[PDB]
Amino acid sequence: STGSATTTPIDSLDDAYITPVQIGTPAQTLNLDFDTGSSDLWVFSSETTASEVDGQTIYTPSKSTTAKLLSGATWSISYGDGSSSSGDVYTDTVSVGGLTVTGQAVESAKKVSSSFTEDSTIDGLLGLAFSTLNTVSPTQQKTFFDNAKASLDSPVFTADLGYHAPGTYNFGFIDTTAYTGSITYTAVSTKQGFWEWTSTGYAVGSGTFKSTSIDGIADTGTTLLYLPATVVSAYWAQVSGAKSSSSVGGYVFPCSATLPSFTFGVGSARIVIPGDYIDFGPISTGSSSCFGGIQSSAGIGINIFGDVALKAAFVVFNGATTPTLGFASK
Ligand code: NA
């Protein structure tokens, strides 16, 4: 089997991407944030505290003929940005882009934090990291990908995120028309439950490539590129008037600037992030201070190849017995 779904930026800054997902019988379509950084499929629901729901589409398990309470199961998750959600669990039929899983754990939110309530465009998350991070207790549940894997023509999914444009999530096949040149594959560690790999280095603009090992995760549910403080300082040093602002919470730069590109290594291959990808616009409406798309990972405890980096590439998440990542230019 295979599936193929379009993913659409939620706003003019590409803060996140939503993908339609069919849940239940008859189908209830919810727009989910596909997150290679986490392993829970959770939704706004008919059980979500009514004061915490502000325009999201909700899943109603009582309207699904295939929904079954997963008796006694609960979940609770905390994300890197301080957001959280929790609730109980149903199993139901879930389809992405024509690919169907029966008996998927659908985590129904009773409670969501303010950041989720305030984002009307995101109806929930669909985790695509390793199932060892799933939060369901007392019986840990599998991801959508882990449930589909054995039915797929190839045990892979790919992420092809757009810059200020729609892109694609594919399951069970490589679209050889979606990328230029060849795919370079690199080793993955599953030890922390993430798609954790080691970049071979970086360059700023037209500068010389610095060979250096940068361990990080490929995370479609993080907006920005978070790298070590040395690498981020070298990047913003090339932008006149750029500085780290304790008040704003990261590097800002004059909105009048032209940003340089940033290059990261994948083995002997190179992925170039165009400067425009690194502009996240005014810090507040009408400000001439703009927020940077490359920020320090110091304090987060991990480097994160978020959407700024991944949307410059065609990315293969290879879930074979030994997982690997692949990157191609596009
Ligand atoms: Na922000």
Swiss-Prot record:
The chain holds residues 90 to 419 of 419 of the full protein. The gene is EAPA. It comes from the Eukaryota. Residues 17-328 form the Peptidase A1 domain. Keywords: Aspartyl protease, Disulfide bond, Hydrolase, Protease, Signal, Zymogen. It is an enzyme of class 3 (hydrolase). The keyword Hydrolase applies. Its EC number is 3.4.23.22. This is Endothiapepsin. The keyword Transferase does not apply. Belongs to the peptidase A1 family. The active site is at 35, 199. Disulfide bonds join 255-290. It catalyses: Hydrolysis of proteins with specificity similar to that of pepsin A, prefers hydrophobic residues at P1 and P1', but does not cleave 14-Ala-|-Leu-15 in the B chain of insulin or Z-Glu-Tyr. Clots milk. GO terms for biological process: proteolysis. GO terms for molecular function: aspartic-type endopeptidase activity.
